Amino acid sequence: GITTPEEMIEKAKGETAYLPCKFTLSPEDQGPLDIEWLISPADNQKVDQVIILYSGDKIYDDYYPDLKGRVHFTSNDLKSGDASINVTNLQLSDIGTYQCKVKKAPGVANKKIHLVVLVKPSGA
Amino acid sequence: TPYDPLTLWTTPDPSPNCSLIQELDAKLTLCLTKNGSIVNGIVSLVGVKGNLLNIQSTTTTVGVHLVFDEQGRLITSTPTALVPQASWGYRQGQSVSTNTVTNGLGFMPNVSAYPRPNASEAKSQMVSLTYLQGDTSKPITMKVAFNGITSLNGYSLTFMWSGLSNYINQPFSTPSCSFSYITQE
Structure with missing residues (x-):
């Protein structure tokens, strides 16, 4: 499963947000590894929008237009147990709940991060 | 048994698992449950990338196929919609x-x-x-x-x-659609 609970990350416009998603695999989890990150924007009604994906040993991005080029996995070895990603140059539009799904049949886990972006620094 | 032998599905919330027009551009959620000689099925399809997010003016139909072998085991190659790494089998959790x-x-x-x-x-x-x-x-x-x-x-x-x-200019998306059929065995 994923090593961290549902959390809230508060950043400032322009900064970069690090969305942690580390996981441990069980001996039973013998199926192929899939890592999907979805987002439910606060500004609109869309829910569970695909942001980035790791399937069949390949990375697939370019799903959520407004987030183009600003999302990348942080680790250079996902299989090792780290699905974390970075959202660079945060904008107020990036606010919403980001979800990390890590699957290895029969294994499945997910984590929800509520990202908040503030015009200028301070959560004081 | 850890799994249910009467159910075959793609899991309730599959990841893009089809490359209909372009790589991993769609999510196909399919669940089949065997009730004697009849299978109760519920299918749902939704575009997540490319033209499937913006139905082209000329598009009149969107479809997918699932081809199985003589043992009823799915074949993950054209024209089967589900990609090779996609989940498909007995339900377990x-x-x-x-x-x-x-x-x-x-x-x-x-x-x-x-x-x-x-x-x-x-x-x-x-x-x-x-x-x-x-x-x-x-x-x-x-x-x-x-x-x-x-x-x-x-x-x-x-x-x-x-x-x-x-x-x-509408993403292609269906509701959960029911169907059923008589089973081979």
């Missing part, structure tokens, strides 16, 4: 069991009832009216063909959502 399906013919459409060369026959079809987006102002039809895109000793399920012609 919110995921899929890694066991191989050994009672596959219990989920396959009966070939005596739906002969391989009979896909054009009304009987090899279950057609219903439904709605794009689930929006009752956007009616569409769903046709499920049994064993029409077969092999020999093989089986198949085909899903065609038609009447899309007059729906533009």
Whole structure:
């Protein structure tokens, strides 16, 4: 499963947000590894929008237009147990709940991060 | 048993698992449950990338096929929609069991009832009216063909959502659609 609970990350416009998603695999989890990150924007009604994906040993991005080029996995070895990603140059539009799904049949886990972006620094 | 031998699904919340027009551009959620000689099925399809997010003006139909071998085991190659790494098998929790399906013919459409060369026959079809987006102002039809895109000793399920012609700049998305068929075994 994923090593961290549902959390809230508060950043400032322009900064970069690090969305942690580390996981441990069980001996039973013998199926192929899939890592999907979805987002439910606060500004609109869309829910569970695909942001980035790791399937069949390949990375697939370019799903959520407004987030183009600003999302990348942080680790250079996902299989090792780290699905974390970075959202660079945060904008107020990036606010919403980001979800990390890590699957290895029969294994499945997910984590929800509520990202908040503030015009200028301070959560004081 | 850790898994349910009466259910074959893609898991409730699959990741883009089809490359219909372009790589991993769609999510196909499919669940099949065996109730004696009848399989109760619920299918749902939604575009997540490319033209499937913006139905082209000329598009009139969007469809997918699932082709199985003589043991009822899915074949992950054209024209099967689900990609090779996609989850498909017995249900185990919110995921899929890694066991191989050994009672596959219990989920396959009966070939005596739906002969391989009979896909054009009304009987090899279950057609219903439904709605794009689930929006009752956007009616569409769903046709499920049994064993029409077969092999020999093989089986198949085909899903065609038609009447899309007059729906533009809309992502392709269906409601959970029900269907059923007589089983091979």
